[PDB]
Design an enzyme around this catalytic site. Structure first.
Site, PDB file in Angstrom:
ATOM      1  CB  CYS A   1      70.267 -27.711 -33.478  1.00  0.00           C
ATOM      2  SG  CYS A   1      71.881 -26.947 -33.689  1.00  0.00           S
TER       3      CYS A   1
ATOM      4  CB  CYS B   1      76.567 -29.903 -31.802  1.00  0.00           C
ATOM      5  SG  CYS B   1      77.715 -30.548 -33.010  1.00  0.00           S
TER       6      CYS B   1
ATOM      7  CB  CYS C   1      73.479 -23.193 -34.483  1.00  0.00           C
ATOM      8  SG  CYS C   1      71.738 -23.247 -34.995  1.00  0.00           S
TER       9      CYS C   1
ATOM     10  CG  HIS D   1      47.491 -28.504 -17.012  1.00  0.00           C
ATOM     11  ND1 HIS D   1      47.165 -28.938 -15.748  1.00  0.00           N
ATOM     12  CD2 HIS D   1      48.820 -28.228 -16.987  1.00  0.00           C
ATOM     13  CE1 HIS D   1      48.254 -28.938 -14.992  1.00  0.00           C
ATOM     14  NE2 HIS D   1      49.268 -28.501 -15.715  1.00  0.00           N
TER      15      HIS D   1
HETATM   16  O1  LIG Z   1      54.144 -27.905 -15.785  1.00  0.00           O
HETATM   17  C1  LIG Z   1      53.399 -27.280 -16.540  1.00  0.00           C
HETATM   18  N1  LIG Z   1      52.980 -27.714 -17.738  1.00  0.00           N
HETATM   19  O2  LIG Z   1      53.416 -28.921 -18.192  1.00  0.00           O
HETATM   20  C2  LIG Z   1      52.870 -25.926 -16.103  1.00  0.00           C
HETATM   21  C3  LIG Z   1      51.864 -25.254 -16.669  1.00  0.00           C
HETATM   22  C4  LIG Z   1      51.606 -24.073 -16.064  1.00  0.00           C
HETATM   23  C5  LIG Z   1      52.435 -23.801 -15.055  1.00  0.00           C
HETATM   24  C6  LIG Z   1      52.320 -22.646 -14.120  1.00  0.00           C
HETATM   25  O3  LIG Z   1      52.519 -22.904 -12.922  1.00  0.00           O
HETATM   26  N2  LIG Z   1      51.906 -21.425 -14.438  1.00  0.00           N
HETATM   27  C7  LIG Z   1      51.790 -20.484 -13.316  1.00  0.00           C
HETATM   28  C8  LIG Z   1      52.954 -19.540 -13.350  1.00  0.00           C
HETATM   29  N3  LIG Z   1      52.976 -18.910 -14.670  1.00  0.00           N
HETATM   30  C9  LIG Z   1      53.527 -17.691 -15.088  1.00  0.00           C
HETATM   31  C10 LIG Z   1      54.170 -16.794 -14.219  1.00  0.00           C
HETATM   32  C11 LIG Z   1      54.172 -15.429 -14.524  1.00  0.00           C
HETATM   33  C12 LIG Z   1      54.776 -14.510 -13.669  1.00  0.00           C
HETATM   34  C13 LIG Z   1      55.396 -14.939 -12.491  1.00  0.00           C
HETATM   35  C14 LIG Z   1      55.396 -16.301 -12.173  1.00  0.00           C
HETATM   36  C15 LIG Z   1      54.787 -17.217 -13.026  1.00  0.00           C
HETATM   37  C16 LIG Z   1      53.264 -17.578 -16.399  1.00  0.00           C
HETATM   38  N4  LIG Z   1      52.596 -18.665 -16.825  1.00  0.00           N
HETATM   39  C17 LIG Z   1      52.388 -19.513 -15.817  1.00  0.00           C
HETATM   40  C18 LIG Z   1      51.663 -20.897 -15.799  1.00  0.00           C
HETATM   41  S1  LIG Z   1      53.481 -25.074 -14.788  1.00  0.00           S
HETATM   42 ZN   LIG Z   2      53.516 -29.832 -14.338  1.00  0.00          ZN
HETATM   43 ZN   LIG Z   3      70.758 -24.804 -33.705  1.00  0.00          ZN
END
Ligand SMILES: O=C(NO)c1ccc(C(=O)N2CCn3c(-c4ccccc4)cnc3C2)s1
Ligand SMILES: [Zn+2]
Ligand SMILES: [Zn+2]
Ligand SMILES: [K+]
Ligand SMILES: [K+]
Length: 391
Positions: A18, A20, A91, A143
């Protein structure tokens, strides 16, 4: 000039492009690099899909075929399937509909493109076509394990790129530094028995109580890889949060001495920016400045003759990831960086950080000569460590 910093990016990674720009992470970073003119000083590199064989350097065949191939190939209903993949936006543009089953399918396709984009940049740097590079890539990869996607990751881009360096170019020693606030469990797994690649992760660990729950300082490798996995795990929670002084001290006492001893031929960075301020307490919790990352980049540029590539991993706050991406690219281009505040240079690392650093140094003194010589100076500020080297 052609021997300079490369950038890789590809609009086919986006849910919605997109003008802008609304507007997600990588589209915003690309605009900041464009807007500041850094892209103009850089060589833009064309990405591509990783091959299935390339992905299989790290992941199982079954994993690769499931997540790496277009599902429609296995299957009026085509026109109907194509129709609901898309949605028209306020948009006036169209995008992949995030409310549908195609959200995760598209993200896995984006992941396959991300790996090829990183591989292309890494190979141009490793071969000397380019000096340096930054990959503006999504989703993150670090991961993803051999046969398990997790934490928004489908394919481990940095690990694939390392495997291909070893197999195609016979690169003797590769250093991977991972400074995303989360442990790179995928990357650790991929090289855990291999002494030809040194994996170093800085992450919030808090004794196993932070996503993904792996990466204890104990985990040093297996077999001939014993000694070549370094988990700079911070423990103690947020009392107080880790910031610039703590990470700078961790580079001074753990990262740079070990990496310097190892003496790598290429450096790859899993460059998440979720440790920077603007990432509340369950997501991140830490408050590094964006400018600190420009300094960490400059440190790593002292290794491998400057043959380094950073690949975007995590980070969510747009201001934070744009500020940080700007600092890292500016560093790679050799520009003068904004000086760190006197405050940060004077600050002693907090007690939890010193404890964490000393635990790692103790474990790894067994494997590295640089940690056998002396007593710890982890608790000094940078100004103090500078002062107390001289005479
Ligand atoms: O930085 C990242 N990927 O690049 C992350 C991958 C997974 C992350 C993570 O901390 N998770 C734990 C919290 N979480 C949630 C939550 C769901 C309910 C409340 C708080 C967090 C859903 N999915 C995740 C994955 S950060
Ligand atoms: Zn991370
Ligand atoms: Zn857009
Ligand atoms: K990490
Ligand atoms: K290793």
């Amino acid at each position: 000039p052609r021997f300079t910093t490369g950038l890789v990016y590809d609009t086919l990674m986006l849910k919605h492009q997109c003008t802008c720009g609304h507007a997600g992470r990588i589209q915003s970073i690309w605009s900041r690099l464009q807007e500041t003119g850094l892209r103009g000083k850089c060589e833009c590199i064309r990405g591509r899909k990783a091959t299935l064989e390339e992905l299989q350097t790290v992941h199982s065949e079954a994993h690769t075929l499931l997540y790496g191939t277009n599902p429609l190939n296995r299957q009026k209903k085509l026109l109907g399937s194509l129709a609901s993949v898309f949605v028209r936006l306020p948009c006036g543009g169209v995008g992949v509909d995030s409310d549908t089953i195609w959200n995760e399918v598209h993200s896995a396709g984006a992941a396959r493109l991300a790996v090829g984009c990183v591989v292309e940049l890494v190979f141009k740097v490793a071969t000397g076509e380019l000096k340096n590079g930054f990959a503006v890539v999504r989703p993150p990869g670090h991961h993803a394990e051999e046969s398990t996607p997790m934490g928004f990751c489908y394919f481990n881009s940095v690990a694939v790129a390392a495997k291909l360096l070893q197999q195609r170019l016979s690169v003797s020693k590769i250093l991977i530094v991972d400074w995303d606030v989360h442990h790179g469990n995928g990357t650790q797994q991929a090289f855990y028995s291999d002494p030809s690649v040194l994996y170093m992760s800085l992450h919030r660990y808090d004794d196993g109580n932070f996503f993904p729950g792996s990466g204890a300082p104990d985990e040093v490798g297996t077999g001939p890889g014993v000694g070549f996995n370094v988990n700079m795990a911070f423990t103690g929670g947020l009392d107080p949060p880790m910031g610039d002084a703590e990470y700078l001290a961790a580079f001074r006492t753990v990262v740079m001495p070990i990496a310097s001893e190892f003496a790598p031929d290429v450096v790859l960075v899993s460059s998440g920016f979720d440790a920077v301020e603007g990432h509340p307490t369950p997501l991140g919790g830490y408050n590094l400045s964006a400018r600190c990352f420009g300094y960490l980049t400059k440190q790593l540029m002292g290794l491998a003759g400057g043959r380094i590539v950073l690949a975007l991993e995590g980070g969510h706050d747009l201001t934070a990831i744009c500020d940080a991406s700007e600092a890292c690219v500016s560093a790679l281009l050799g520009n003068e960086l904004d000086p760190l505040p006197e405050k940060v240079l004077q600050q002693r690392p907090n007690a939890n950080a010193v404890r964490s650093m000393e635990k790692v140094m103790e474990i790894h003194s067994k494997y590295w000569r640089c940690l056998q010589r002396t007593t710890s100076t982890a608790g000094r500020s940078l100004i103090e460590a500078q002062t107390c080297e001289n005479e």
